[PDB]
Inverse folding.
């Protein structure tokens, strides 16, 4: 359900990018309410969300690897690794150049799946608003777990998902000697289609089966898709940038 | 105006912490709308906001000082300082305790005013959800500008403000040679009463006048209070406790 100003948007024709149509159909048909001040905001969400999808695929293809925090590394042209495994943007380096380098020199990087999600958000935002506006607003950067600079992010409960969502597979009876498998953050790329950093681009069964193989002795509870979604607050983000 | 589960909340008696009644009454009477899925959820917001106010006051009295990023320091028992000026939680230090140390050993810390706001949010959250839930969720921490570990924070346009809001005094024609005076992030502690890291607890006039004394030659634009509020998203946070 899409509401622009206070008018409900029904099947009302438009000359927009085709690859946006599937998402827009989801957002119109869903019971979930999307409120916008304007069409430009809605258009920003559509493009940002499909750019999140594209960026996840870009990261997947990049050659960047999975590593635990203590094994994390990056291109020292742009990033310093803290002892705890944070990737710190070096003094006065351009944020967009440094973040895009992850895509362009993937082999020089390895990091965690949460870190990968934030990276994907930044890559998508850069693709959406351009290097100049991104650098102006998100001018200091450290990539580390779920740290982000200024981004307005929220997580909500429910079973209705949309392309570009960040979702989570929980593995409740994971093997305690392998806490790395307690669950998996993913980007929703398509119907039953996920980006999962370190695992690849897989469907749900694949992810759940993989998780289920690293459970404790005698474990009976299967891994499963949590009913929640982590999302960028587009009106708030629109405000910062545009 | 408070609406809970689709029902308006008008004056209705309750057995709650007196400390919360002013804010509650303020949030009922105002024309702006607050929506909750439960009473528990509203109670969380009242407590969280009053804890933000208390935390600002705590930081004020702690002895923690203002410093630029390049001059930022912290208690090295808990925090390492990156070259760029980030305060990085040391490997396997308890997050709640490291953050609380800012209040308990204030003179060992100096940091910038965005960093200060984030610290106040963490201090308030610990007070609101307790150390166990805090440490379970916010298990990795770097204090640096507007970096957040999982915090759901957004900024909206408006001119109706409430206790615990984060506001901004802008200095459009600040002296380019004194960039720290670009503006001042504040927490609203009461009517025309602000916590301003590095300035103290001041009214609006005092902050504007202070800012105005660090403007370029011949400046005809006064520093002024922006029509915006920075806020924690309660439903995202409330997920944690229920």
């Amino acid at each position: 359900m899409i509401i622009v100003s206070g008018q409900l948007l029904r099947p009302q024709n438009w000359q927009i990018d085709q690859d946006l149509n599937p998402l827009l159909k989801e957002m119109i048909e869903t019971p979930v309410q999307f409120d916008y001040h304007s069409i430009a905001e809605l258009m920003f969400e559509l493009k940002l969300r499909m750019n999140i999808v594209a960026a996840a695929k870009t990261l997947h293809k990049s050659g960047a690897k999975f590593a635990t925090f203590l094994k994390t590394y990056g291109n020292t042209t742009y990033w310093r690794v803290s002892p705890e495994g944070a990737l710190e943007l070096k003094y006065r380096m351009p944020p967009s150049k440094a973040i895009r380098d992850i895509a362009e020199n993937g082999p020089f990087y390895a990091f965690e799946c949460a870190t990968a999600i934030v990276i994907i958000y930044y890559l998508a935002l850069i693709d959406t608003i351009g290097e100049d506006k991104f650098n102006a607003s998100f001018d200091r950067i450290i990539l580390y777990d779920w740290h982000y600079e200024k981004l307005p992010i929220y997580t909500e409960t429910g079973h209705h998902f949309f392309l570009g969502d960040c979702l989570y597979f929980k593995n409740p009876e994971f093997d305690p000697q392998k806490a790395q498998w307690r669950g998996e953050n993913v980007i929703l790329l398509g119907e039953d289609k996920y980006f999962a950093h370190g695992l690849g681009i897989l469907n749900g069964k694949q992810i759940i089966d993989k998780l289920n193989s690293f459970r404790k002795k005698g474990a009976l509870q299967s891994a499963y898709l949590l009913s929640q979604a982590t999302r960028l607050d587009v009106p708030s983000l629109f405000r910062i940038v545009r």
Observations:
- The helical segments of chain B are 21-29, 39-62, 95-104, 113-129, 131-137, 204-212, 234-241.
